[PDB]
PDB file of C-alpha atoms and ligand atoms in Angstrom:
ATOM      1  CA  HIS X  13     170.221 165.526  71.576  1.00  0.00           C
ATOM      2  CA  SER X  14     167.140 163.719  70.316  1.00  0.00           C
ATOM      3  CA  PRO X  15     164.547 165.832  68.308  1.00  0.00           C
ATOM      4  CA  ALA X  16     162.031 164.835  70.972  1.00  0.00           C
ATOM      5  CA  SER X  17     160.093 166.264  73.834  1.00  0.00           C
ATOM      6  CA  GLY X  18     161.892 166.208  77.182  1.00  0.00           C
ATOM      7  CA  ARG X  19     158.578 165.701  79.102  1.00  0.00           C
ATOM      8  CA  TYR X  20     159.739 168.391  81.486  1.00  0.00           C
ATOM      9  CA  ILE X  21     156.245 169.218  82.762  1.00  0.00           C
ATOM     10  CA  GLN X  22     155.599 165.654  83.834  1.00  0.00           C
ATOM     11  CA  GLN X  23     159.048 165.618  85.438  1.00  0.00           C
ATOM     12  CA  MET X  24     158.276 168.745  87.490  1.00  0.00           C
ATOM     13  CA  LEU X  25     154.938 167.303  88.577  1.00  0.00           C
ATOM     14  CA  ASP X  26     156.545 164.037  89.764  1.00  0.00           C
ATOM     15  CA  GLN X  27     159.214 165.993  91.706  1.00  0.00           C
ATOM     16  CA  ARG X  28     156.614 168.266  93.283  1.00  0.00           C
ATOM     17  CA  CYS X  29     154.639 165.125  94.176  1.00  0.00           C
ATOM     18  CA  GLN X  30     157.720 163.542  95.843  1.00  0.00           C
ATOM     19  CA  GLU X  31     158.023 166.687  97.988  1.00  0.00           C
ATOM     20  CA  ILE X  32     154.337 166.566  98.990  1.00  0.00           C
ATOM     21  CA  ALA X  33     154.579 162.869  99.921  1.00  0.00           C
ATOM     22  CA  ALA X  34     157.685 163.698 102.053  1.00  0.00           C
ATOM     23  CA  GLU X  35     155.761 166.547 103.812  1.00  0.00           C
ATOM     24  CA  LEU X  36     152.783 164.315 104.476  1.00  0.00           C
ATOM     25  CA  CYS X  37     155.043 161.649 105.965  1.00  0.00           C
ATOM     26  CA  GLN X  38     156.552 164.329 108.276  1.00  0.00           C
ATOM     27  CA  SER X  39     152.969 165.095 109.267  1.00  0.00           C
ATOM     28  CA  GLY X  40     152.562 161.437 110.328  1.00  0.00           C
ATOM     29  CA  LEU X  41     150.853 160.052 107.234  1.00  0.00           C
ATOM     30  CA  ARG X  42     152.626 156.668 107.374  1.00  0.00           C
ATOM     31  CA  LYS X  43     151.608 155.396 103.930  1.00  0.00           C
ATOM     32  CA  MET X  44     153.422 158.392 102.382  1.00  0.00           C
ATOM     33  CA  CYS X  45     156.783 157.511 103.878  1.00  0.00           C
ATOM     34  CA  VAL X  46     158.333 156.055 100.743  1.00  0.00           C
ATOM     35  CA  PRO X  47     161.339 156.553  98.545  1.00  0.00           C
ATOM     36  CA  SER X  48     161.044 158.970  95.676  1.00  0.00           C
ATOM     37  CA  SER X  49     161.025 156.103  93.120  1.00  0.00           C
ATOM     38  CA  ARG X  50     157.555 155.255  94.375  1.00  0.00           C
ATOM     39  CA  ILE X  51     155.810 158.576  93.709  1.00  0.00           C
ATOM     40  CA  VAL X  52     154.506 160.098  90.479  1.00  0.00           C
ATOM     41  CA  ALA X  53     151.863 162.675  89.488  1.00  0.00           C
ATOM     42  CA  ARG X  54     148.870 161.227  87.401  1.00  0.00           C
ATOM     43  CA  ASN X  55     145.753 162.877  86.219  1.00  0.00           C
ATOM     44  CA  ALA X  56     143.087 160.265  87.036  1.00  0.00           C
ATOM     45  CA  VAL X  57     140.021 159.236  89.008  1.00  0.00           C
ATOM     46  CA  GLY X  58     140.757 158.489  92.716  1.00  0.00           C
ATOM     47  CA  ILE X  59     139.031 156.165  95.160  1.00  0.00           C
ATOM     48  CA  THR X  60     135.296 155.435  94.860  1.00  0.00           C
ATOM     49  CA  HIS X  61     133.274 158.768  94.637  1.00  0.00           C
ATOM     50  CA  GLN X  62     136.446 160.565  93.441  1.00  0.00           C
ATOM     51  CA  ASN X  63     135.119 160.314  89.920  1.00  0.00           C
ATOM     52  CA  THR X  64     136.445 163.328  88.163  1.00  0.00           C
ATOM     53  CA  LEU X  65     139.908 163.688  86.583  1.00  0.00           C
ATOM     54  CA  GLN X  66     142.292 165.432  88.978  1.00  0.00           C
ATOM     55  CA  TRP X  67     146.000 165.777  89.493  1.00  0.00           C
ATOM     56  CA  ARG X  68     147.036 163.482  92.403  1.00  0.00           C
ATOM     57  CA  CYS X  69     150.327 162.195  93.811  1.00  0.00           C
ATOM     58  CA  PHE X  70     150.282 158.436  93.571  1.00  0.00           C
ATOM     59  CA  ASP X  71     152.204 155.733  95.270  1.00  0.00           C
ATOM     60  CA  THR X  72     153.068 153.526  92.180  1.00  0.00           C
ATOM     61  CA  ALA X  73     152.915 150.360  94.366  1.00  0.00           C
ATOM     62  CA  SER X  74     149.142 151.018  94.683  1.00  0.00           C
ATOM     63  CA  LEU X  75     148.620 151.487  90.927  1.00  0.00           C
ATOM     64  CA  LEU X  76     147.190 148.550  88.868  1.00  0.00           C
ATOM     65  CA  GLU X  77     149.274 147.306  85.892  1.00  0.00           C
ATOM     66  CA  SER X  78     146.360 147.962  83.517  1.00  0.00           C
ATOM     67  CA  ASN X  79     142.949 149.604  83.559  1.00  0.00           C
ATOM     68  CA  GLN X  80     139.367 148.528  82.821  1.00  0.00           C
ATOM     69  CA  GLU X  81     137.243 151.724  83.207  1.00  0.00           C
ATOM     70  CA  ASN X  82     136.805 154.381  84.056  1.00  0.00           C
ATOM     71  CA  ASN X  83     140.169 154.036  85.865  1.00  0.00           C
ATOM     72  CA  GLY X  84     143.181 154.695  83.571  1.00  0.00           C
ATOM     73  CA  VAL X  85     145.922 157.184  84.619  1.00  0.00           C
ATOM     74  CA  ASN X  86     147.049 160.082  82.459  1.00  0.00           C
ATOM     75  CA  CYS X  87     150.412 161.814  82.078  1.00  0.00           C
ATOM     76  CA  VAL X  88     150.966 165.239  80.534  1.00  0.00           C
ATOM     77  CA  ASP X  89     152.818 166.414  77.398  1.00  0.00           C
ATOM     78  CA  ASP X  90     154.821 169.651  77.166  1.00  0.00           C
ATOM     79  CA  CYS X  91     151.800 171.536  75.865  1.00  0.00           C
ATOM     80  CA  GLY X  92     149.731 170.669  78.964  1.00  0.00           C
ATOM     81  CA  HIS X  93     147.575 167.889  77.526  1.00  0.00           C
ATOM     82  CA  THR X  94     146.844 164.808  79.534  1.00  0.00           C
ATOM     83  CA  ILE X  95     147.252 161.555  77.675  1.00  0.00           C
ATOM     84  CA  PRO X  96     146.812 157.940  78.790  1.00  0.00           C
ATOM     85  CA  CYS X  97     149.835 156.328  80.211  1.00  0.00           C
ATOM     86  CA  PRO X  98     150.354 152.868  81.627  1.00  0.00           C
ATOM     87  CA  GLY X  99     148.582 151.871  84.793  1.00  0.00           C
ATOM     88  CA  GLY X 100     145.235 151.982  86.526  1.00  0.00           C
ATOM     89  CA  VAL X 101     143.679 153.323  89.708  1.00  0.00           C
ATOM     90  CA  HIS X 102     142.629 150.811  92.326  1.00  0.00           C
ATOM     91  CA  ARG X 103     139.328 152.395  93.385  1.00  0.00           C
ATOM     92  CA  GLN X 104     139.370 150.865  96.886  1.00  0.00           C
ATOM     93  CA  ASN X 105     143.081 150.716  97.587  1.00  0.00           C
ATOM     94  CA  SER X 106     144.722 153.638  95.775  1.00  0.00           C
ATOM     95  CA  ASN X 107     147.393 155.415  97.947  1.00  0.00           C
ATOM     96  CA  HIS X 108     147.402 159.003  96.672  1.00  0.00           C
ATOM     97  CA  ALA X 109     147.050 162.673  97.585  1.00  0.00           C
ATOM     98  CA  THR X 110     144.915 164.865  95.438  1.00  0.00           C
ATOM     99  CA  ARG X 111     146.747 168.084  94.709  1.00  0.00           C
ATOM    100  CA  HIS X 112     144.815 169.506  91.881  1.00  0.00           C
ATOM    101  CA  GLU X 113     145.478 173.243  92.248  1.00  0.00           C
ATOM    102  CA  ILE X 114     149.235 173.138  92.855  1.00  0.00           C
ATOM    103  CA  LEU X 115     149.774 170.611  90.097  1.00  0.00           C
ATOM    104  CA  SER X 116     147.516 172.432  87.539  1.00  0.00           C
ATOM    105  CA  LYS X 117     149.434 175.611  88.300  1.00  0.00           C
ATOM    106  CA  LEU X 118     152.809 173.924  87.594  1.00  0.00           C
ATOM    107  CA  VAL X 119     151.364 172.648  84.287  1.00  0.00           C
ATOM    108  CA  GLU X 120     150.423 176.215  83.289  1.00  0.00           C
ATOM    109  CA  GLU X 121     153.899 177.382  84.165  1.00  0.00           C
ATOM    110  CA  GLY X 122     155.484 174.524  82.239  1.00  0.00           C
ATOM    111  CA  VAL X 123     153.306 175.317  79.140  1.00  0.00           C
ATOM    112  CA  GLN X 124     154.900 178.800  78.822  1.00  0.00           C
ATOM    113  CA  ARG X 125     158.393 177.310  79.007  1.00  0.00           C
ATOM    114  CA  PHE X 126     157.994 174.172  76.856  1.00  0.00           C
ATOM    115  CA  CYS X 127     155.052 174.269  74.415  1.00  0.00           C
ATOM    116  CA  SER X 128     155.931 174.911  70.771  1.00  0.00           C
ATOM    117  CA  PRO X 129     153.940 177.867  69.434  1.00  0.00           C
ATOM    118  CA  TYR X 130     153.623 175.775  66.209  1.00  0.00           C
ATOM    119  CA  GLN X 131     152.250 172.789  68.095  1.00  0.00           C
ATOM    120  CA  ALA X 132     149.957 175.126  70.119  1.00  0.00           C
ATOM    121  CA  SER X 133     148.418 176.417  66.862  1.00  0.00           C
ATOM    122  CA  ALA X 134     148.012 172.847  65.550  1.00  0.00           C
ATOM    123  CA  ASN X 135     146.286 171.886  68.840  1.00  0.00           C
ATOM    124  CA  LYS X 136     144.083 175.057  68.824  1.00  0.00           C
ATOM    125  CA  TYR X 137     142.834 174.300  65.320  1.00  0.00           C
ATOM    126  CA  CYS X 138     142.063 170.738  66.414  1.00  0.00           C
ATOM    127  CA  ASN X 139     140.331 171.762  69.648  1.00  0.00           C
ATOM    128  CA  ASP X 140     138.268 174.484  67.963  1.00  0.00           C
ATOM    129  CA  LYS X 141     136.982 172.011  65.391  1.00  0.00           C
ATOM    130  CA  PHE X 142     136.755 168.804  67.513  1.00  0.00           C
ATOM    131  CA  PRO X 143     136.699 169.625  71.259  1.00  0.00           C
ATOM    132  CA  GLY X 144     139.192 167.668  73.356  1.00  0.00           C
ATOM    133  CA  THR X 145     141.472 166.644  70.473  1.00  0.00           C
ATOM    134  CA  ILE X 146     145.105 167.424  69.830  1.00  0.00           C
ATOM    135  CA  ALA X 147     147.337 167.267  66.729  1.00  0.00           C
ATOM    136  CA  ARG X 148     149.880 164.458  65.967  1.00  0.00           C
ATOM    137  CA  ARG X 149     151.250 163.147  62.730  1.00  0.00           C
ATOM    138  CA  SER X 150     150.633 159.522  63.526  1.00  0.00           C
ATOM    139  CA  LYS X 151     148.843 156.237  62.612  1.00  0.00           C
ATOM    140  CA  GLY X 152     145.126 155.705  61.995  1.00  0.00           C
ATOM    141  CA  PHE X 153     142.814 152.773  62.207  1.00  0.00           C
ATOM    142  CA  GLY X 154     144.182 149.346  61.321  1.00  0.00           C
ATOM    143  CA  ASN X 155     147.383 150.557  59.587  1.00  0.00           C
ATOM    144  CA  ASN X 156     150.657 150.642  61.466  1.00  0.00           C
ATOM    145  CA  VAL X 157     152.705 152.354  58.678  1.00  0.00           C
ATOM    146  CA  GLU X 158     150.959 155.371  57.344  1.00  0.00           C
ATOM    147  CA  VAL X 159     151.116 158.689  59.220  1.00  0.00           C
ATOM    148  CA  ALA X 160     149.159 161.883  58.599  1.00  0.00           C
ATOM    149  CA  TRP X 161     148.313 164.980  60.582  1.00  0.00           C
ATOM    150  CA  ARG X 162     145.104 164.331  62.573  1.00  0.00           C
ATOM    151  CA  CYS X 163     143.017 165.638  65.402  1.00  0.00           C
ATOM    152  CA  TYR X 164     143.164 162.775  67.932  1.00  0.00           C
ATOM    153  CA  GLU X 165     140.964 162.273  70.961  1.00  0.00           C
ATOM    154  CA  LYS X 166     143.394 162.206  73.846  1.00  0.00           C
ATOM    155  CA  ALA X 167     141.962 158.967  75.299  1.00  0.00           C
ATOM    156  CA  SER X 168     142.943 157.187  72.025  1.00  0.00           C
ATOM    157  CA  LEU X 169     146.680 158.207  72.378  1.00  0.00           C
ATOM    158  CA  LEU X 170     149.390 156.412  74.230  1.00  0.00           C
ATOM    159  CA  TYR X 171     151.865 158.399  76.244  1.00  0.00           C
ATOM    160  CA  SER X 172     154.542 155.738  75.987  1.00  0.00           C
ATOM    161  CA  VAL X 173     154.446 155.933  72.121  1.00  0.00           C
ATOM    162  CA  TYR X 174     156.271 158.889  70.623  1.00  0.00           C
ATOM    163  CA  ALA X 175     154.665 160.353  67.497  1.00  0.00           C
ATOM    164  CA  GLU X 176     155.549 163.322  65.274  1.00  0.00           C
ATOM    165  CA  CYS X 177     154.671 166.819  66.392  1.00  0.00           C
ATOM    166  CA  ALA X 178     155.758 170.361  65.474  1.00  0.00           C
ATOM    167  CA  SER X 179     159.072 171.658  66.992  1.00  0.00           C
ATOM    168  CA  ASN X 180     159.330 175.305  67.942  1.00  0.00           C
ATOM    169  CA  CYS X 181     160.743 176.084  64.493  1.00  0.00           C
ATOM    170  CA  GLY X 182     157.797 174.314  62.802  1.00  0.00           C
ATOM    171  CA  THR X 183     160.004 171.293  61.848  1.00  0.00           C
ATOM    172  CA  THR X 184     159.954 167.582  62.650  1.00  0.00           C
ATOM    173  CA  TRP X 185     159.785 166.724  66.350  1.00  0.00           C
ATOM    174  CA  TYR X 186     158.508 163.737  68.351  1.00  0.00           C
ATOM    175  CA  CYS X 187     156.217 163.971  71.402  1.00  0.00           C
ATOM    176  CA  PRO X 188     154.720 161.436  73.813  1.00  0.00           C
ATOM    177  CA  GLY X 189     151.167 160.558  72.839  1.00  0.00           C
ATOM    178  CA  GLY X 190     150.928 158.501  69.629  1.00  0.00           C
ATOM    179  CA  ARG X 191     149.114 155.567  67.992  1.00  0.00           C
ATOM    180  CA  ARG X 192     150.200 152.043  67.154  1.00  0.00           C
ATOM    181  CA  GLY X 193     147.745 151.826  64.161  1.00  0.00           C
ATOM    182  CA  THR X 194     146.104 148.755  65.730  1.00  0.00           C
ATOM    183  CA  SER X 195     142.486 147.780  65.070  1.00  0.00           C
ATOM    184  CA  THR X 196     140.648 148.676  68.316  1.00  0.00           C
ATOM    185  CA  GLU X 197     137.630 150.932  68.886  1.00  0.00           C
ATOM    186  CA  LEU X 198     139.933 153.701  70.317  1.00  0.00           C
ATOM    187  CA  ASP X 199     142.030 153.494  67.122  1.00  0.00           C
ATOM    188  CA  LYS X 200     139.101 155.142  65.274  1.00  0.00           C
ATOM    189  CA  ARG X 201     138.873 158.244  67.453  1.00  0.00           C
ATOM    190  CA  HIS X 202     140.505 160.927  65.274  1.00  0.00           C
ATOM    191  CA  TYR X 203     139.852 163.247  62.374  1.00  0.00           C
ATOM    192  CA  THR X 204     142.440 163.495  59.589  1.00  0.00           C
ATOM    193  CA  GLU X 205     143.017 167.138  58.796  1.00  0.00           C
ATOM    194  CA  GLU X 206     146.115 167.413  56.711  1.00  0.00           C
ATOM    195  CA  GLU X 207     145.299 170.785  55.161  1.00  0.00           C
ATOM    196  CA  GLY X 208     143.763 172.411  58.209  1.00  0.00           C
ATOM    197  CA  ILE X 209     146.620 171.383  60.549  1.00  0.00           C
ATOM    198  CA  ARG X 210     149.325 172.340  58.055  1.00  0.00           C
ATOM    199  CA  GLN X 211     147.841 175.764  57.502  1.00  0.00           C
ATOM    200  CA  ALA X 212     147.461 176.185  61.283  1.00  0.00           C
ATOM    201  CA  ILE X 213     151.162 175.261  61.519  1.00  0.00           C
ATOM    202  CA  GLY X 214     152.092 177.482  58.541  1.00  0.00           C
ATOM    203  CA  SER X 215     150.316 180.552  59.996  1.00  0.00           C
ATOM    204  CA  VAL X 216     152.540 180.902  63.119  1.00  0.00           C
ATOM    205  CA  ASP X 217     155.108 183.699  63.142  1.00  0.00           C
ATOM    206  CA  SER X 218     158.747 182.717  63.049  1.00  0.00           C
ATOM    207  CA  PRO X 219     160.691 183.433  66.236  1.00  0.00           C
ATOM    208  CA  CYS X 220     163.608 184.355  63.906  1.00  0.00           C
ATOM    209  CA  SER X 221     164.329 187.036  61.263  1.00  0.00           C
ATOM    210  CA  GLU X 222     163.481 186.071  57.697  1.00  0.00           C
ATOM    211  CA  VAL X 223     167.258 186.076  57.430  1.00  0.00           C
ATOM    212  CA  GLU X 224     168.185 183.843  60.497  1.00  0.00           C
ATOM    213  CA  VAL X 225     168.138 179.978  60.671  1.00  0.00           C
ATOM    214  CA  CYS X 226     165.894 178.514  63.342  1.00  0.00           C
ATOM    215  CA  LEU X 227     167.285 175.487  65.155  1.00  0.00           C
ATOM    216  CA  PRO X 228     164.568 173.914  67.362  1.00  0.00           C
ATOM    217  CA  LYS X 229     164.959 173.213  71.059  1.00  0.00           C
ATOM    218  CA  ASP X 230     163.040 171.300  73.747  1.00  0.00           C
ATOM    219  CA  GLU X 231     162.389 174.645  75.495  1.00  0.00           C
ATOM    220  CA  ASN X 232     161.301 178.049  74.187  1.00  0.00           C
ATOM    221  CA  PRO X 233     162.772 180.033  72.480  1.00  0.00           C
ATOM    222  CA  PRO X 234     164.611 178.013  69.706  1.00  0.00           C
ATOM    223  CA  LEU X 235     168.167 179.007  68.588  1.00  0.00           C
ATOM    224  CA  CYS X 236     168.238 181.760  65.897  1.00  0.00           C
ATOM    225  CA  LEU X 237     171.464 182.004  63.917  1.00  0.00           C
ATOM    226  CA  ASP X 238     172.462 184.344  61.089  1.00  0.00           C
ATOM    227  CA  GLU X 239     172.111 182.779  57.567  1.00  0.00           C
TER     228      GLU X 239
HETATM  229  C1  LIG Y 301     134.717 157.794  63.364  1.00  0.00           C
HETATM  230  C2  LIG Y 301     135.679 158.884  63.780  1.00  0.00           C
HETATM  231  O1  LIG Y 301     135.642 159.320  64.928  1.00  0.00           O
HETATM  232  N1  LIG Y 301     136.583 159.364  62.903  1.00  0.00           N
HETATM  233  C3  LIG Y 301     136.760 158.951  61.502  1.00  0.00           C
HETATM  234  C4  LIG Y 301     136.956 160.218  60.673  1.00  0.00           C
HETATM  235  C5  LIG Y 301     135.802 161.223  60.668  1.00  0.00           C
HETATM  236  O2  LIG Y 301     134.659 160.630  60.047  1.00  0.00           O
HETATM  237  C6  LIG Y 301     136.109 162.645  60.126  1.00  0.00           C
HETATM  238  O3  LIG Y 301     134.971 163.244  59.470  1.00  0.00           O
HETATM  239  C7  LIG Y 301     137.371 162.870  59.291  1.00  0.00           C
HETATM  240  O4  LIG Y 301     137.607 164.304  59.177  1.00  0.00           O
HETATM  241  O5  LIG Y 301     137.187 159.803  59.323  1.00  0.00           O
HETATM  242  C8  LIG Y 301     138.411 159.097  59.070  1.00  0.00           C
HETATM  243  O6  LIG Y 301     138.442 158.709  57.668  1.00  0.00           O
HETATM  244  C9  LIG Y 301     138.211 159.716  56.682  1.00  0.00           C
HETATM  245  C10 LIG Y 301     137.338 159.115  55.564  1.00  0.00           C
HETATM  246  O7  LIG Y 301     136.018 158.901  56.107  1.00  0.00           O
HETATM  247  C11 LIG Y 301     137.382 160.033  54.311  1.00  0.00           C
HETATM  248  O8  LIG Y 301     136.598 159.559  53.174  1.00  0.00           O
HETATM  249  O9  LIG Y 301     138.771 160.206  53.933  1.00  0.00           O
HETATM  250  C12 LIG Y 301     139.552 160.937  54.890  1.00  0.00           C
HETATM  251  C13 LIG Y 301     140.987 161.088  54.410  1.00  0.00           C
HETATM  252  O10 LIG Y 301     141.458 162.338  54.896  1.00  0.00           O
HETATM  253  C14 LIG Y 301     139.589 160.181  56.210  1.00  0.00           C
HETATM  254  O11 LIG Y 301     140.469 159.039  56.125  1.00  0.00           O
HETATM  255  C15 LIG Y 301     139.599 160.010  59.336  1.00  0.00           C
HETATM  256  O12 LIG Y 301     139.476 161.239  59.315  1.00  0.00           O
HETATM  257  O13 LIG Y 301     140.703 159.534  59.489  1.00  0.00           O
HETATM  258  C16 LIG Y 301     138.426 157.816  59.921  1.00  0.00           C
HETATM  259  C17 LIG Y 301     138.051 158.120  61.378  1.00  0.00           C
HETATM  260  O14 LIG Y 301     138.046 156.917  62.175  1.00  0.00           O
HETATM  261 CL1   CL Y 302     155.263 167.068  74.140  1.00  0.00          CL
END
């Protein structure tokens, strides 16, 4: 038991994608006849002219190892935010199936199960003030030690880096989507908001009596135990 996100929403999406690829193969779509290990859900551009971000089922053998632009893939955290993860879309050769409605719907279901009400408030404060940002306690520009609560632009985060977030008791937790504190242009795309985020976090109602002890969990609700 790590005090860390289980990435359950992403996990559902990949599984649902594996099912869809299997169905398509049964329908004769030869390129979709692959083992499960080869299919994931990414939120990304598609082939040329498929220029918006959509949930699609990708064959990982058709993914590039890195991106240039505007072709990076995104994964999703347990609050429903899409965050860069490794890989890139080959705009001519991608093997995928766009499944935007089914996959979006599973995200919305997964948000009710898995998203910490304390993290949701931290994210709401961030999005209200700086549209498209979410809250982490992580690194800033050109400094790989110091952490602070900030509103980060999602494109500047890395899914494969875990960074501090709020658990569903408003305590220390770690979530995919963090910073390395390197010195790139993306490493500047955040707004430090220690007081605002902390007060957003502080303003959420406890899921436990003032007399119970809240033990966080990677799914809602947390454990409440008598003091
Ligand atoms: C350029 C950008 O997107 N973000 C800046 C950010 C913003 O300017 C924002 O207004 C911060 O709320 O500013 C950052 O640095 C800040 C300093 O400019 C300020 O004097 O001290 C602040 C300490 O809380 C803060 O460090 C930021 O918020 O982190 C740098 C960031 O790249
Ligand atoms: Cl998360």
